[PDB]
Symmetry: D2
Subunit: 285 residues, 4 copies
């Protein structure tokens, strides 16, 4: 028969960490998933749980570690969780932690931030994935997800192959809408702020996508826009070792009103839930 | 078998309206539902479709009206849709239109707005409902939904009835998290977009209080009534207001059995169950 | 200002009730929502919680009631919950409970039901709503939801109005797909087997939709199919006083392949998530049967 | 900076195929995703779309192939899609197709099936994944998802490590509820009835989970139940080369009512949406 992979853990452990400096409260809410691989496989083979750390104990441990070490950075948290299970149990040979941060934002009005009120603001969501082998260092990925953006021009698609199944007319203008998924690996020898990096890749992604605020910038391809973001990210940020990106192309099609004796192109568009294009790529150094 | 109520229509008609003033593009993406009641019931009784406006035709009409009359306000849009079907068809005795606007926001960095880039920003979602009888005026409700907010203090709950099933301790400090649903009917005398922003601001005012210190809330019922009161006064054309405040729980994780003293730095976000506090007040005053 | 409506409660209280008769286990998992109206309004006006039953207590109470009276009918359950809050607290003037039952089904293979294994089977979901005023009786609604069905013919749509915005071709054959929502009120005087009723309305609904096996039955309108179900239900089931129905018309459109020099009609269809038609109606008992 | 992997395609291409054999109609509704990798990267590097098959064209192709070729086997459909793009375009070096079938079931009462009525019945959902390199064979996975089951006994959990963070009491009886995800690769040189193989793996899954219908075989470990399914399946089906399983452990906790003066043990339980346990494993064959 033979084994290829094993893993058990707890998913969707949710936590809100609160810090109080007088009237000024700070929060971090996360959802966490933890998987462990054991050296023994007798749990699978015979039903012997004597090496099993109960998933309930994994959940408690995430809660405790958040209390003892706080969160501060989601990457730090996951490293601490990994570090904890590799140190405390010698038959634990691999740990993996995924963390997603709820996009809470401090209330803001007329330039002043509220001391203890927050509004849920999913304008890009920070997540991370840390994996660590027994007696090896941790590999850290950070990422953006759930960032939804739409520009009404400076996008075109032309010069493509036209086979017997191609009805797509070429265009110099179209809507470009997407939901960014962007995941990058870090090198090593750390020295990364993590939170500052994340803000930076996000700043870039939104730059390559929308360009200068007065003129904007034409993109001839979703593929190009993707690759540009990647190159500019590995440039402005040395500690990143690779980047995976996935861009849906969410369609807003011109509604043909010919059959009604009307001319639209292109003021009324149909937003389609599906299907959608999906352009992906991963580059490294 | 006496008929009580009838209605047919099209749901989830999605439209993106794009207006182009030079390089400066403006959008409104909505999802629309339209219901009509007919005077004859022969379609129900016998299968006689001779009075039916096909729902497909209703969809086409939403698309067309979006082209010709634009999308100034979703309230305007829905009135247009209502008026069209009552005026154009003598056997249509009732029209009802629901519209929800996708929370797109123009890109911004340091106060400068992008000419054609938008980011999906669900920090309160504008919807509206218009109903109109044949030869009567249209009744307009407008509303807020999907506004999710959390404050980590200035909230308490005490002085309640303690029966034999009450294990809830009284508290002077707690998290308050909610998802606002707020729906108001208008009188007859209105800037819809301005009214909406205003009620929203009152809502966020009563929930979080002054940005320096906050404001104690002793009761979600109380916070609800204040918003209703501050709103009908500050906005005369509002005739009544319905509010629904979930109380989404963040419970302190008791770590006693593990030898830790938490209270109250690490909390558990619960998806369910949750409290639901609701109320409708009408004028006057 | 003046008050029009108030209500507070706990939503999404979930419970699994397990009964064990030897090796033979039977379950019911529900999700419950409870709202109460108080006589006092001092909670809203001044922040005075002295008349408030904590929502946590409402939640605890639902758990306890499921333990004490069990839950053999979700309608029964909801009635018990209502009566509990009206009896135990005199300043509670209205109670409303919504209950939805998880469509668990006993494992079945080659004709035998398993003693304690269940498979989640959303082929129609039982829900109910009970409302009760202080010193009045309870009104009981039961319902079907989340029942999704598709027939590939015996449906047509023609003879409709064609204005300047009508591009819809008339048709004698089309796919009909829907997700049934069906909610009925009961009369009174009791004598109702809530669970027995529910299976039959579902039986009816599914009958009026697909007709006789082997041949099927033509539907000329979603509106017609809707009314028939209503009439046939108020007939076969005397204790029902009204019925509300909502039938989405979920579109499967022929994919036109002309532009590629191909002829489809009608073997490849496009399932649309939206938009969709929505045909609704409520009939009440006074006249008619059959 | 250099490329590691690229791919582009269309997702969520939905199709309903209707075949009419007289009065007897048969359907298969699927949702399909297709990804292609190209040899040139000038689309990425420079904005040169001259090698791109438009994703709209990919969509059209799925529709057409569904029309000329059939569906029936979801695996067949995905291989066809793969075959088409590797054949028709030599600059396409990889094709990957994911297909999920909507769980429609013919109306039924005691074995009498309706000729054209179907009810949506998610009691196990068939999916498949086919991947293929240029001038290599297709690699085929099939799988089960969204199969949600609960047994109220014949499950226990004891003999585990109890550290200082362990408050979990050992138990000999408990609810076990899960949502099965099960994905297997096929060998090759396969004379495979995909639909039958799928029904076979599914009932093996349900067998090891619930045991005999009269009694109900005890499971001392979800890890154990997982391995049994993997083992019984590679045996009953030679053409399977490996199997991946993921079993959530969805919690139903006894509601402690002591603080209210009640003894509940254990007729009323709390269904928790999260967190949940997740037990996974992949075995291959020799």
């Amino acid at each position: 028969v033979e084994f290829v992979r094993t893993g058990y853990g707890k998913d969707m452990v949710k936590v809100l960490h609160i810090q109080r400096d007088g009237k000024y409260h700070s929060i971090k809410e996360v959802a966490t998933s933890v998987q462990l691989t054991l050296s023994s496989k007798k749990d699978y083979l015979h039903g012997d749980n004597s090496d099993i750390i109960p998933t309930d104990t994994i959940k408690n441990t995430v809660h405790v570690l958040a209390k003892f070490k706080g969160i501060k950075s989601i990457e730090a948290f996951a490293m601490n969780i990994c570090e904890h299970f590799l140190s405390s149990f010698n038959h634990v040979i691999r740990a993996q932690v995924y963390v997603e941060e709820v996009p809470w934002k401090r209330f803001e009005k007329n330039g002043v931030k509220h001391v203890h009120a927050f509004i849920h603001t999913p304008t890009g969501t920070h997540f991370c994935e840390v994996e660590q082998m027994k007696s090896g260092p941790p590999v850290i990925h950070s990422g953006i997800k759930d960032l939804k953006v739409l520009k009404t021009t400076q996008s075109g698609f032309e010069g493509f192959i036209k086979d017997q199944f191609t009805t797509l007319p070429e265009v110099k203008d179209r809507c470009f809408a997407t939901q960014v998924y962007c995941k990058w690996r870090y090198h090593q020898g750390r020295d990364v702020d993590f939170e500052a990096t994340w803000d930076t890749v996000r700043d870039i992604v939104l730059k390559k996508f929308a360009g200068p605020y007065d003129k904007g910038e034409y993109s001839p391809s979703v593929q190009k826009t993707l690759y540009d973001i990647q190159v500019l990210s590995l440039s402005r940020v040395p500690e990143i070792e690779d980047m995976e990106i996935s861009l849906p192309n969410i369609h807003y099609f011109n509604i043909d009103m010919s059959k009604m004796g009307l001319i639209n192109k292109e003021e009324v568009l149909l937003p389609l839930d599906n299907p959608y294009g999906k352009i992906t790529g991963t580059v490294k150094r």
